[PDB]
Write an enzyme that holds these catalytic residues in place. Structure first.
Site, mmCIF file in Angstrom:
data_model
loop_
_atom_site.group_PDB
_atom_site.id
_atom_site.type_symbol
_atom_site.label_atom_id
_atom_site.label_comp_id
_atom_site.label_asym_id
_atom_site.label_seq_id
_atom_site.Cartn_x
_atom_site.Cartn_y
_atom_site.Cartn_z
ATOM 1 N N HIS A 4 5.975 -27.447 -12.241
ATOM 2 C CA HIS A 4 5.034 -28.347 -11.577
ATOM 3 C C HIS A 4 5.028 -28.019 -10.092
ATOM 4 O O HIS A 4 5.760 -27.145 -9.629
ATOM 5 C CB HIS A 4 5.417 -29.813 -11.814
ATOM 6 C CG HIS A 4 6.744 -30.164 -11.224
ATOM 7 N ND1 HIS A 4 7.931 -30.060 -11.929
ATOM 8 C CD2 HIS A 4 7.093 -30.440 -9.936
ATOM 9 C CE1 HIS A 4 8.938 -30.353 -11.121
ATOM 10 N NE2 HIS A 4 8.465 -30.567 -9.908
ATOM 11 N N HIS A 46 1.983 -37.782 -10.876
ATOM 12 C CA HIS A 46 2.778 -37.308 -9.673
ATOM 13 C C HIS A 46 2.751 -35.690 -9.234
ATOM 14 O O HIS A 46 2.954 -35.218 -8.116
ATOM 15 C CB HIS A 46 4.229 -37.653 -10.017
ATOM 16 C CG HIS A 46 4.451 -39.104 -10.329
ATOM 17 N ND1 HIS A 46 4.827 -39.535 -11.581
ATOM 18 C CD2 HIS A 46 4.356 -40.209 -9.554
ATOM 19 C CE1 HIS A 46 4.972 -40.852 -11.559
ATOM 20 N NE2 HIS A 46 4.691 -41.284 -10.341
HETATM 21 ZN ZN ZN Z 1 9.457 -30.843 -8.190
#
Ligand code: ZN
Ligand SMILES: *[C@@H]1O[C@H](CO)[C@@H](O[C@@H]2O[C@H](CO)[C@@H](O[C@@H]3O[C@H](CO)[C@@H](O)[C@H](O)[C@@H]3O)[C@H](O)[C@H]2NC(C)=O)[C@H](O)[C@H]1NC(C)=O
Ligand SMILES: *[C@@H]1O[C@H](CO)[C@@H](O[C@@H]2O[C@H](CO)[C@@H](O)[C@H](O)[C@H]2NC(C)=O)[C@H](O)[C@H]1NC(C)=O
Ligand code: CL
Ligand code: CL
Ligand code: CL
Ligand code: ZN
Lengths: 258, 258
Positions: free
Chosen positions: B90, B64
């Site tokens: 991230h 993801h």
């Molecule tokens: Zn995030």
């Protein structure tokens, strides 16, 4: 399966986790006459251990013990600057005619032992603390046989029937966790060791109460003869042999000699 | 198994996690002239973010995003007595010809966004902080297109070819994490929201820098066209739509109507 092991046979634990072949492992044989008195070792302080019934707590048969997951906010101070957050507690026991504590005292094994496992406040993740000096701390007390039922322990032991099968779990109301431990916070032994199961990671600060907790013989039977372990046999004798000291000095918070 | 979800496709997220249908979700559209100016919001401070090369850090394509695991000892202070331990960072990005930031400013979507996820110092376990007010804190900055290569980002972007496959990972040397973030710590927006992926747990303190970071176009292409995700498709457009305010106030640390 990188995470399966058992008591009493193969796979050898160093194959599961090489750290189990380490030099500073737990448990150990405590010899009070040879423990070093350290007066800086002040009475332990437990904050937040008297829980209300809600929220409930997970109680699980993991194949290796029964483990109670503790909620946030339980703090244990070994001293100012040595502060820890409690994660879970679990137990070690024997079998019919056989004691099963992990620590021993002058070679004497007690019927059972409770461990309360904590994470240093330096860490946000248990896995990062593994193997680091002081990353984890365990509070340990011996469970001795006595004539009276222990009402605090009955709250958990009466629920073991619900989780007899390996892997099964249930929810229990919050209870006073500190009533599972001795009332004397001032007399204890302390040393640096390891987890007593794989991965056997070192750097764990062990604190072992000098005062015992009393359970009835009926309660100790309930503990050691209700749960099933991996591969269909009774979960029993779930303790590790004591380990070489390798130069470590066990400290005492009280003049332990005679 | 319920740890299973995708961007722009089934299952609908409130099936994954009913918490995703909550009233206080993230991200949101930030409207600087309607944010509440709060002069008590002090400049952010980051401790421990200037990492040495060793130990190395895990860099993983989790399908993801690309996620960098941060070592112990990194803290963000949002205000006196209000500290958070950094766990991981991230990124969120778009596709060829399409921006992919999660937050927007007056409806403007930036090319990409970085998130640094933190756990309040009150907790030892991320899972226990989920859904609790203030239990998690995310620090976010926008990535904008500029003419020059960003040397700090190149340290990570040059390694994405190594983790193109979904679920692959590598190790990268420690770097100055604060060089991935804007240098102005005094101008930011702050509001209470949620995780932007399932389980969408609420109680998260979001802090969004007003100053942007600049990446070259050829860096933004590397970010958005290197990794593969679920199915056999490129990992692209990995952002969630902005969410209804439901009476929440977005605070600004600076007069943002000016
Ligand atoms: Zn995030
Ligand atoms: C708590 O700490 C006390 C020390 O303050 C420990 O008591 C000591 O225990 C040992 C082992 O029981 C006693 O040694 C024994 O003495 C008897 C009588 O002579 C002897 O027959 C045995 O062969 C053995 O040598 C020791 O005297 C005793 N000392 C005192 C001051 O009472 C105790 O074991 C600790 N308990 C735990 C659970 O940690
Ligand atoms: C940072 O804050 C500034 C305001 O201090 C924002 O700039 C304003 O943007 C709006 C709408 O885009 C325009 O009304 C204003 O004219 C701009 N104002 C000023 C004073 O320059 C800017 O959008 C913010 N940027 C981010 C990324 O948050
Ligand atoms: Cl060793
Ligand atoms: Cl950590
Ligand atoms: Cl916790
Ligand atoms: Zn144990």
């Amino acid at each position: 399966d990188q995470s399966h092991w058992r008591y009493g046979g193969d796979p050898p634990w160093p194959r599961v986790s090489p750290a189990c072949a380490g030099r500073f492992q737990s448990p150990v044989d405590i010899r009070p006459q040879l423990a070093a008195f350290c007066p800086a070792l002040r009475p332990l302080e437990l904050l937040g251990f008297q829980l209300p019934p809600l929220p409930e707590l997970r109680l699980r048969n993991n194949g290796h013990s029964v483990q109670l997951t503790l909620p946030p906010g339980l703090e244990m101070a070994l001293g100012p600057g040595r502060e820890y957050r409690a994660l879970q507690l679990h137990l070690h026991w024997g079998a019919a005619g056989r004691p099963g504590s992990e620590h021993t005292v002058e070679g004497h094994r007690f019927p059972a032992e409770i461990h309360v496992v904590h994470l240093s406040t330096a860490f946000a993740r248990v896995d990062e603390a593994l193997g680091r000096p002081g990353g984890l701390a365990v509070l340990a007390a011996f469970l001795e046989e006595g004539p009276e039922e222990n009402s605090a322990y009955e709250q958990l032991l009466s629920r073991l029937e619900e989780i007899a099968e390996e892997g099964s779990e249930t929810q229990v109301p919050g209870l006073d966790i500190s009533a599972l431990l001795p009332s004397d916070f001032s007399r204890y032994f302390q040393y640096e060791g390891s987890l007593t199961t794989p991965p056997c990671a070192q750097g764990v600060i062990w604190t072992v109460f000098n005062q015992t907790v009393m359970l009835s013989a009926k309660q100790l039977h309930t503990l050691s003869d209700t749960l099933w372990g991996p591969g269909d046999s009774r979960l029993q004798l779930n303790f590790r042999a004591t380990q070489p000291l390798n130069g470590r000095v066990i400290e005492a918070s009280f003049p332990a000699g005679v």
